[PDB]
User: Which sequence fits this backbone?
């Protein structure tokens, strides 16, 4: 690490393919933060593009249920030697994966409040025309006061070919799996369904071992998909596999989750569907009786203007992307002078 005399590192808390997250605190004030070192940020084209996407998306959003950038450290060395980017972020106590899968409490009210906040965050996000495409419990961060923030926007796109490799298997929407040529904000609401069902039972809803077994377990609850959907499948082998299986009626959610709440299973049923148009939106989900306790439309804003993904469609070299990223770091600091 290399954060200067402004911050103070404590302990490493997270690590992925393109990020080393660590807790810290600012010395002038004392408040706790998360610093995320992106090492060798400009060495690979895909990694540089993800980095510039996250910076622009997180700079666009200002919402209590979306991770915010608190600061981006400027280059300490001259430009040519600037290899590692440091991003200062909201520090959060844990994530929902850890919360669900532990000896911690998770009563119905926990699920209701967590779900409300996720959906509150998605309403704002979706109004900006941004699909997250990778919502899972481990990307839903939770703080000491039970506030839930959505994080990791590197997979996020707006409104390609190999769609079945978008996201993680267990939370991947059918339309991506089967390539149904209708990819919208609806993708996220499938994932929210899986998250919701996971909180109710404290185990994964559709834990598939492989591509085919993922389709099995989904069809064991939802039943066999309709002929309209079946014909919409692009690959010959998948369509052939579904048609070989016998017809199956949908199992009621009241039987899938026996002891669970009646109003919860109602809203779950509106999320977990084969047809993406058949799924309830985030905005309509907030209007459901299950979330009546927390719902207030004056406290649930949209995002305006929407997010432009045109920058990501450009064919830029590693250096041009480094220039683009450095421009954002400059723009961030220039925006905080008024
Ligand atoms: C005070 C330490 O709190 C934590 C403990 C654990 N652990 C202890 C280790 C156990 O094995 C597992 C749970 C995990 C996370 C946090 N907090 C935290 N806050 C903020 C972020 C973050 N994590 N990372 C890693 C993210 C993860 C997913 C998506 C986004 C982020 C992100 O961008 N930020 C800034």
Assistant:
């Amino acid at each position: 690490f290399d954060v200067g005399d402004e911050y103070e590192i404590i302990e490493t808390i997270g690590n992925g393919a393109y990020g080393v997250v660590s807790s810290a605190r600012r010395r002038l004030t004392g408040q706790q933060v998360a610093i995320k070192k992106i090492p060798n940020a400009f060495d690979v084209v895909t990694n540089a593009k993800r980095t510039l996407r996250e910076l622009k998306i997180l700079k666009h959003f200002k919402h209590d249920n979306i991770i915010a950038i608190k600061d981006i450290l400027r280059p300490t060395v001259p430009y040519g030697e600037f290899k590692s980017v440091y991003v200062v972020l909201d520090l959060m106590e844990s994530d929902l994966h850890q919360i669900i899968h532990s000896s911690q409490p998770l009563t119905l009210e926990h699920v209701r409040y967590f779900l409300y906040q996720l959906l509150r965050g998605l309403k704002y996000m979706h109004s900006a025309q941004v699909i997250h495409r990778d919502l899972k419990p481990s990307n839903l961060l939770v703080n000491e006061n039970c506030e839930l923030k959505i994080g990791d926007f590197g997979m996020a796109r707006g409104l390609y070919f190999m769609t079945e490799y978008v996201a993680t298997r267990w939370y991947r929407a059918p339309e991506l799996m089967l390539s149904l040529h209708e990819y919208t904000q609806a993708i996220d609401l499938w994932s929210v369904g899986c998250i919701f069902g996971e909180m109710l039972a404290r185990r994964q809803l559709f834990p598939g071992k492989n591509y085919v077994h993922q389709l099995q377990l989904i069809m064991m609850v939802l039943g066999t998909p309709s002929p309209a959907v079946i014909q919409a499948v692009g690959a010959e082998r998948v369509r052939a596999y579904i048609q070989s299986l016998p017809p199956r009626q949908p199992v009621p959610w009241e039987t899938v989750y026996p002891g669970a709440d009646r109003q919860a299973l109602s809203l779950l049923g509106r999320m977990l569907r084969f047809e993406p148009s058949a799924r309830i939106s985030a905005a309509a989900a907030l209007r459901h009786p299950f979330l009546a306790k927390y719902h207030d439309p004056d406290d649930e804003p949209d995002c305006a203007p929407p997010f432009d993904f045109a920058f990501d469609r450009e064919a830029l070299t590693r250096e041009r992307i480094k220039e683009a990223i450095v421009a954002e770091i400059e723009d961030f600091h220039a925006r905080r002078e008024g």
